[PDB]
Amino acid sequence: ERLDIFGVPIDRVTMIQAVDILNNFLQENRLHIVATPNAEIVMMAQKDKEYMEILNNTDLNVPDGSGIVFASKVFKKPLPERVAGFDLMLEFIKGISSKGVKIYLLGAAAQVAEQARANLEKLYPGVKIVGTHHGYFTEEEENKIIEEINNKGAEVLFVALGAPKQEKWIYKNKDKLKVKIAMGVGGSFDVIAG
Amino acid sequence: ERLDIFGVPIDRVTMIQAVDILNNFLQENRLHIVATPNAEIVMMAQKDKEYMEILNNTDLNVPDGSGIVFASKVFPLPERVAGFDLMLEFIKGISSKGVKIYLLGAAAQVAEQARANLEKLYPGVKIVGTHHGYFTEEEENKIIEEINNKGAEVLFVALGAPKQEKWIYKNKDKLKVKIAMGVGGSFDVIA
């Protein structure tokens, strides 16, 4: 089920299998941490012990980009396909948009997650995005942000802070966040906000 | 020819067109800066004025990943391209042409392992030198001099965005290469 790319475990999953695993996570009443490691993240983890530890403690590590798939070719069972973290997020949203799954968007500059919300509502009619908040917050602002996420009863939280900040923030707040899925999505809100 | 994605100019090119442009850059006696902007880079450039300036002064910006292509759907980029595949496809073509390549970046012996693996993958490839990326100021002088003395034409900079673009741009008048391109974690995955 998993392969090791320089200490980083990667779930041997296709896009469809990753979406199915995320849907199954919604049936388990606990926080699930999802990361999408790519070649850049593997490189970063070699120099960042804390990041390497987090990546070894997530519920699902979906491969992102081409580089990580190429690295897996050394194995008898390589990674089955090239997956983009961006496409995984959209495909997962698409499926839950008709199920009433409460989504929270946290990250990017002022009004970017609001614009992303407006655009996702047009793209996926019926999507339930319960709240949004910018990603250039201090540690002081953090507790009020987590309280709003929890008060709105969010089931899925997309964290557009960029790697490794997004994984580190989720992991540090793993016992505070009352969501079922927390997933780092990097620049995904910016490109949907157009 | 170029699309603006939140201030970042993106060359409206397919992978093959990008490879053809890079081949043509080898015929021009000047440094060409190549970046592969993705959604993450676009986001970084909104808060980093110096990075935004560099991305507006590169010779070629090839789209990387799905997010940036999705953003272009407003009016689009012809295809989803990975910067990693662009690097390999460009190496593949120049491996039989004697084009000198320098590998700079990544931890300890990763760049040298990447060199060994590229020599197996593309027989005839001319990688004249390698160096790790966690270098000091005194080491930069030695690296730049090695790059120029060995006569490298193509430089792959595996330092990660924005460090890779910033390092190339700061040293744009020191580097005697025809192409300098940031490649992120590309050496690690070839090693």
Residue numbers in the entry:
A (entry chain A): 3 to 196
B (entry chain E): 3 to 77, 80 to 195
Paper passage:
To gain insight into the mechanism of catalysis, we determined the 2.0 Å crystal structure of the TagA enzyme from Thermoanaerobacter italicus (TagAΔC, residues Met1-Gly195).
Selenomethionine (SeMet)-labeled TagAΔC in its apo-form crystallized in the P21 space group as a dimer, with eight molecules per asymmetric unit. Each protomer consists of eight β–strands and nine α-helices that form two distinct regions. The N-terminal region of TagA is formed by helices H2 to H4 that pack against a β-hairpin constructed from strands β1 and β2, while its larger C-terminal region is comprised of a six-stranded parallel β-sheet (β–strands β4, β3, β8, β7, β5, and β6) that is surrounded by seven helices (helices H1, H3, and H5 to H9). In the dimer, the C-terminal helix H8 in one subunit packs against helices H2 and H4 located in the N-terminal region of the adjacent protomer, burying 1,212 Å2 of solvent accessible surface area to produce a narrow pore (detailed in S6 Fig). Consistent with the native and SeMet-labeled proteins adopting similar quaternary structures, introduction of V43E and A72R mutations into TagAΔC disrupts dimerization. The C-terminal appendage is presumably unstructured in dimeric forms of the enzyme, as, importantly, the contact surface used to engage the appendage is occluded by inter-subunit interactions in the crystal structures of TagAΔC.
